[PDB]
Amino acid sequence: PQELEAYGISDVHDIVYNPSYDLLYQEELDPSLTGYERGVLTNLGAVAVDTGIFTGRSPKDKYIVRDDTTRDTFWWADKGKGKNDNKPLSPETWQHLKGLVTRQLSGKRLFVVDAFCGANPDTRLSVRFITEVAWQAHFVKNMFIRPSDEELAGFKPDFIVMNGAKCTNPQWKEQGLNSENFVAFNLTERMQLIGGTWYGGEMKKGMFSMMNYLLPLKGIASMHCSANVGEKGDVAVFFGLAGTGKTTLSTDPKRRLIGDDEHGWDDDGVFNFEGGCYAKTIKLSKEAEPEIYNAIRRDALLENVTVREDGTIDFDDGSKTENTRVSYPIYHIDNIVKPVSKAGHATKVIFLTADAFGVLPPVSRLTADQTQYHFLSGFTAKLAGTERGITEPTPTFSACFGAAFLSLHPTQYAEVLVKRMQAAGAQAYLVNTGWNGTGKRISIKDTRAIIDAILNGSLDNAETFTLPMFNLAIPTELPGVDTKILDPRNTYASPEQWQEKAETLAKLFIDNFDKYTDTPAGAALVAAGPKL
Ligand SMILES: Nc1ncnc2c1ncn2[C@@H]1O[C@H](COP(=O)(O)OP(=O)(O)OP(=O)(O)O)[C@@H](O)[C@H]1O
Ligand SMILES: [Mn+2]
Ligand SMILES: [Mn+2]
Q1: Residues 6+ apart with CB under 8 A from 208
Q2: Residue 268 C-alpha to ligand 3 middle, in angstroms?
Q3: Ligand 1 in contact with 420 (CB < 6 A)?
Q4: How far is ligand 1, taken at its centre, from the CA of residue 135, in Å?
Q5: How far away, in angstroms, is 282 Cα from ligand 2 center?
Q6: Longest dimension (CA), the chain
Q7: 279 lines ligand 1 (CB under 6 A)
Q8: Alpha-carbon span 298 to 96, nearest angstrom
Q9: Which ligand ends up closest to the CA of 238?
Q10: What whole-number distance in Å separates Cα of residue 455 and Cα of residue 251?
Q11: Test site for ligand 1: of 208, 209, 247, most ligand atoms within 8 A of the Cβ
Q12: If you measure from the C-alpha of residue 504 to the centroid of ligand 3, how many angstroms do you get, rounded to a whole number?
């Protein structure tokens, strides 16, 4: 307990260190629990919980302490270098938030989970997570790397994550913060503090943000991508924003899964940060996604799904949130890289996007300059009007396909990615997992056959022609793929109807890209973007 007292947490009478899966099951199903701690047992064998008022991350509540360690290296929200959520925090307000959390956890029954972030000993974080909520401990047991008993014996944390979801900050107005909630990081004390939000993804993406700070400064790419590997050792990575297909499409029975969301790329190859996968379950189809569906069993942890009185799950019900999720340890997938989630250098780099404007082609091979342009652009889009019965799509441009998690400037991630790709001779591709002129999403079946064709070389050998405006090389046909869909003009009444939309989208790309054109490298990439 005095070790806990070193963190500021007093008088803990009941300490649960390294809780087993069986204990976490017992704790969640305790009929005496109240409120959002409670779990419910589903007919699939997995416990389901509700994560409370927050059912996704709260970027507006994300703060990073600005001090002499971070001042000149962080990509700060206020430093005129493009928009981001790295809002500066004073060390004095940090101490206030730390007092809130440590007092909240003092005198409680605490779960302590030691885990690694990063598959390689030379660059991993040794993270100690502290929570008073059993399903939060379970989330981190699933999603981080579980140490061996030997690693546990000599465990030396170099980052502490203290989850005080049950406390809030009443001084937030005087302190200039956004709300009574907070997700704060301190790189001098090497700690994350959480208040107000119970959502487990803050811890997952928080540690991801810290890897995104430390690794590129050591020459190692740090990537919002999934990754898998063929029997020959050929590695693919799949970038993309939330919901664009990284987890869906890397979970592929023809490939060994490396990881689904967070990877590094060092001198030896591509390596997972995590010990689990965090899948979306909205409208989950057992036929369309059988491996992910099969992972939903005891020790998986369902979030915010609708569970019927009889224990069945209504996966289509988005009432609590569209962001229904399940975490599971990665070995709930049958065909994975083991015992360590890593492989060689990627030779296929796939940018996933869900184009709600219905303009981009299902697949295209990128030039080198197009790769850089679209990596910095980081496009996807949403049908935001759907619940009001309207389409109009809303663009998101998020640098590196994950600006919410970037702690350095986008160009620093671009430069090390390009360096790794060039050394490996990797080829890049752009895949629209989103919409076309039918006003419907491309089927998962068609997208998987597109991925197959990328990975087995058939797309590279295909005859291609250039789609106008975006100047994207697209194939005339592909094995097992519906041929009509390959040219996005074919799903509209006429190519001119596609063109009206392509022009709308091109202007959005051009306007977004302008902020990168204040270096000569950036200005020169304009020629690789869409052209009116
Ligand atoms: N053609 C398609 N390709 C891929 N996914 C599709 C397709 N059509 C529908 N989907 C659905 O879109 C979602 C893809 O989400 P997925 O979990 O792969 O996102 P992600 O990129 O892993 O995001 P995150 O980083 O937030 O975890 C799933 O709900 C999937 O069923
Ligand atoms: Mn995912
Ligand atoms: Mn993600």
Answers
A1: 117, 224, 261, 262, 273, 405
A2: 24
A3: no
A4: 24
A5: 13
A6: 72
A7: yes
A8: 39
A9: 1
A10: 14
A11: 247
A12: 28
Q: What are phi and psi of 528, to 5 degrees?
A: -90, -10
Considering every ligand atom shown, identify the ligand nearest to the alpha carbon of residue 315 and give its number: 1
- Among the atoms of ligand 1, which is closest to the Cα of residue 224? 25
CATH topology of domain 1-34+60-219: Phosphoenolpyruvate Carboxykinase; domain 1 (3.40.449)
201 close to ligand 1 (CB < 6 Angstrom): no
Cβ atoms of 378 and 241 within 8 Å: the answer is yes
Ligand 1 midpoint to CA 362 (Å): 15
Superfamily of domain 35-55+276-333: Phosphoenolpyruvate Carboxykinase, domain 2 (2.170.8.10)
Rounded-to-integer distance, Cα 496 and Cα 362, Å:
19
Edge-first strand order for the sheet with 276-280 is 39-41, 47-49, 301-303, 325-329, 276-280
- Of 143, 135, 138, whose CA–CA distance to 118 is shortest? 143
φ and ψ at 427, to 5 degrees? -110, 145
Instruction: Tell which CATH classification among 3.30.470.20, 3.90.78.10, 3.90.228.20, 3.10.180.10 matches the domain 220-275+336-530.
Output: 3.90.228.20
The method recorded for this entry reads X-ray
CB 332 within 8 A of CB 300: yes
- For residue 37, the CA-to-ligand 1 centroid distance in Å is 28
> Is residue 7 lining ligand 1, measured as CB closer than 6 Å?
no
Establish whether residue 242 lines the binding site of ligand 1, counting it when its CB lies within 6 angstroms of any ligand atom.
yes
Cα separation of 50 and 30, whole Å? 15
Strand intervals (E) in 204-255: 221-223, 225-229, 235-239
Residue whose Cα lies nearest atom 9 of ligand 1: it is 444
Query: Three-state SS for 169?
Result: coil
- Write down the residue that tokens 């080198």 correspond to: 368
Tokens of 298: 């005891």
